[PDB]
Amino acid sequence: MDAVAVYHGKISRETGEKLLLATGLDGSYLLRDSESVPGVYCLCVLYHGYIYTYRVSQTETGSWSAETAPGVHKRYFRKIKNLISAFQKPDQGIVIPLQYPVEK
């Protein structure tokens, strides 16, 4: 994602954990590639020493979404930055709002 300063590319899960833990701040976050599915990404959010990781995918229409619980209204975003902006807001269904970007 060339326009997403928090995108670290194909770093390992544990590398991402260590980058977030170095900040020591709940609400720190980054993006990295999925280790499991080509072209999927992981939004990684620090809270209380654990990295809450939300899989983010693009549709054939170009929109982006995060993995959502069964029965919950799933949200689609035109661009990654719009997903990020939405999840900066209080009380949106992730562990803590996205507050402290860990820039590559």
């Binding site: 020493g49 654990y50 990295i51 993995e67 269904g93």
Partner: peptide, 11 residues
């Protein structure tokens, strides 16, 4: 013993 918790959006 992983520090990563795969999670889903809840709202």
């Amino acid at each position: 013993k992983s520090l990563t918790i795969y999670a889903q959006v809840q709202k």
